[PDB]
C-alpha cells in the first residue's frame, strides 16, 4: 500500500498570505493520478486538483498543484477565508487508493483572552441523583487553553470532559465547554466549585467559582 505523508500537520496563517502543503509518497506515482481535496467541518470532501496540476471545475486560480515521482505540493497564493480548512492529498495510481493524513489550515489573528463563565447544576438534574457543573471559555485565540476543576480546592481528575468549537467564521476565535460530573451526594458535601483557566492572553490564571446554595 502506497503511504502518503503530508507536511505540515497544522498551519496558522492570515488571509492574503501563501500556504504551501507538501505530500511525500512511499513509492513513485504517476502525476496523472495525483489529487488534492478540501474538507470543511461537517461537510463532505471536495476535489480541488487532479493530475497534480489540473484544477477541478470552479476551483479558483490562486490554488495550484505540482509534483512528480514521490514529491507533490499544493500552493494557495492569496489566502481567503473560505480556504481555511483541512486538506488531503491522494494517489489513485494503485488499485489501492490512499490518502495523506491531512493538513489543518486555520486563521491567525490577535491573541484574545477567553471570557470565563461557570454554571451550577440545575434543580432538574439534582433530582435525578447527578450534578453536572459547566464552565465556558468564550471567544479566545489561539486554540490552546487549559481548564482545571477544583472542588473545595482539591484538583479534580478523571471526572470532567471538554470540547472546542470550530474556528468562528466571523471573529476567528474558539470557544471551549467543560463539564465536571459528580453524584448529587458528593455535590452536596462540598461547597466551593471553581473553574481555573490558563491561556496565552492571560497574565495569571483566571478562576471563576460559585458556592453551593449562595
Amino acid at each position: 500500500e502506497i503511504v502518503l505523508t503530508q507536511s505540515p500537520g497544522t498551519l496558522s496563517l492570515s488571509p492574503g498570505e501563501r500556504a504551501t502543503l507538501s505530500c511525500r509518497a512511499s513509492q513513485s506515482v504517476s502525476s496523472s493520478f495525483f489529487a488534492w481535496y478540501q474538507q470543511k467541518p461537517g461537510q463532505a470532501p471536495r476535489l480541488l486538483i487532479y493530475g497534480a496540476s489540473s484544477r477541478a471545475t470552479g476551483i479558483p486560480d490562486r490554488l495550484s498543484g505540482s509534483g512528480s515521482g514521490t514529491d507533490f505540493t499544493l500552493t494557495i497564493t492569496r489566502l481567503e477565508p473560505e480556504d481555511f480548512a483541512v486538506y488531503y492529498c491522494q494517489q489513485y495510481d494503485s488499485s489501492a487508493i490512499t490518502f495523506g493524513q491531512g493538513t489543518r489550515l486555520e486563521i491567525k489573528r490577535t491573541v484574545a483572552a477567553p471570557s470565563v463563565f461557570i454554571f451550577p447544576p440545575s434543580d432538574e438534574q439534582l433530582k435525578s441523583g447527578t450534578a453536572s457543573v459547566v464552565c465556558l471559555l468564550n471567544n479566545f485565540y489561539p486554540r490552546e487553553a487549559k481548564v482545571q476543576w477544583k472542588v473545595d480546592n482539591a484538583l479534580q481528575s478523571g471526572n470532567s470532559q471538554e470540547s472546542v468549537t470550530e474556528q468562528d467564521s466571523k471573529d476567528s476565535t474558539y470557544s471551549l465547554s467543560s463539564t465536571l460530573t459528580l453524584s448529587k451526594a458528593d455535590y452536596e458535601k462540598h461547597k466551593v466549585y471553581a473553574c481555573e483557566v490558563t491561556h496565552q492572553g492571560l497574565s495569571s490564571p483566571v478562576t471563576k467559582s460559585f458556592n453551593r446554595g449562595e
Binding site: 500500500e1 496523472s32 493520478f33 489529487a35 481535496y37 474538507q39 463532505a44 470532501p45 471536495r46 476535489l47 487532479y50 493530475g51 489540473s54 477541478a56 488531503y88 491522494q90 489513485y92 488499485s95 489501492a96 487508493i97 490512499t98 490518502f99 495523506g100 493524513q101 491531512g102 471570557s115 463563565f117 461557570i118 454554571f119 451550577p120 447544576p121 440545575s122 432538574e124 438534574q125 435525578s128 453536572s132 459547566v134 465556558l136 468564550n138 470532559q161 471538554e162 470540547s163 472546542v164 468549537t165 470557544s175 471551549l176 465547554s177 463539564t179 460530573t181 471563576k208 467559582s209 460559585f210
Partner: protein
C-alpha cells in the same frame, strides 16, 4: 448535475449486519467507478474499495478484504456497502464518490454509522442558568446541557431560530457510559435577561425526542 444520494443514518450493536446505499444520477452510471470512503470521528479519509457497476469489477483496499462487501445494482443506479458483523471501530461517516481519471470528482453527503453496545436513548435537557458568575460587565452567558443521549446527532436552536447571534453549540463528548453529552450556550446583554424568555429547542431524531427548555435566571 451529477448527484450522489446516500441512505439515512444507521445505529447498530456489535456483531449486527448492515447495508447502506448510494444512488447516482445525472450521469451514465455504468461508465464510472464508485468508491466507498470511511472517515472515523476526528480522523482522515480511507478508501475502502472501488466497484465498476457496468462489469461489477471490484477492488478492495487490503485492510477491508473480508470485512465488507461492495456491490451494485446498475439498473437502478445504486451502489451498496455491507458488513456481516459490525464492531465499535466501524463507527464513522461513510461517503460514496464517483471515481474516474479526475480522482474522486463527486461526493455524496455521507451516511453516519454508529456501532455501540449502548442502546438508543433520548437526552435530558437541563438549563445552564445565567447569574453573577456568568456575566462579564454587560454581557451574560446562558445555555442548555443536553445530557445522556445516544447516538449522535442532536440539533439545538434558540427561540425557535429567532436567536442566532453569539450562539455556540459545542461538539458532543462521549462519556464513559457510552452516552453522549452536548452543551449549547449563547451570550446576550445582561439587561435583556429580565425582559426576555430564552428557550433552547433540542431535537434528537434517533429517539424521536423533541424538548423545549426555558432557561430562566436563578
Amino acid at each position: 448535475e451529477v448527484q450522489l444520494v446516500q441512505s439515512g443514518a444507521e445505529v447498530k450493536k456489535p456483531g449486527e449486519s448492515l447495508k447502506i446505499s448510494c444512488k447516482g444520477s445525472g450521469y451514465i452510471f455504468t461508465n464510472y467507478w464508485i468508491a466507498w470512503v470511511r472517515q472515523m470521528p476526528g480522523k482522515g479519509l480511507e478508501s475502502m474499495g472501488i466497484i465498476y457497476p457496468g462489469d461489477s469489477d471490484i477492488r478492495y483496499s487490503p485492510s477491508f478484504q473480508g470485512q465488507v462487501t461492495i456491490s451494485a445494482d446498475k439498473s437502478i443506479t445504486t451502489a451498496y456497502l455491507q458488513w456481516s458483523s459490525l464492531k465499535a471501530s466501524d463507527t464513522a461517516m461513510y461517503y460514496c464518490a464517483r471515481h474516474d481519471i479526475e480522482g474522486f470528482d463527486y461526493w455524496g453527503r455521507g451516511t453516519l454509522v454508529t456501532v455501540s453496545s449502548a442502546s438508543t436513548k433520548g437526552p435530558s435537557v437541563f438549563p445552564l442558568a445565567p447569574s453573577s458568575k456568568s456575566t462579564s460587565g454587560g454581557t451574560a452567558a446562558l445555555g442548555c446541557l443536553v445530557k445522556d443521549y445516544f447516538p449522535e446527532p442532536v440539533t439545538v436552536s434558540w427561540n425557535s431560530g429567532a436567536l442566532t447571534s453569539g450562539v455556540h453549540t459545542f461538539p458532543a463528548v462521549l462519556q464513559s457510559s457510552g452516552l453522549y453529552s452536548l452543551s449549547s450556550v449563547v451570550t446576550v446583554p445582561s439587561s435583556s435577561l429580565g425582559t426576555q424568555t430564552y428557550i433552547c429547542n433540542v431535537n434528537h431524531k434517533p429517539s424521536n425526542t423533541k424538548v423545549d427548555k426555558r432557561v430562566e435566571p436563578k
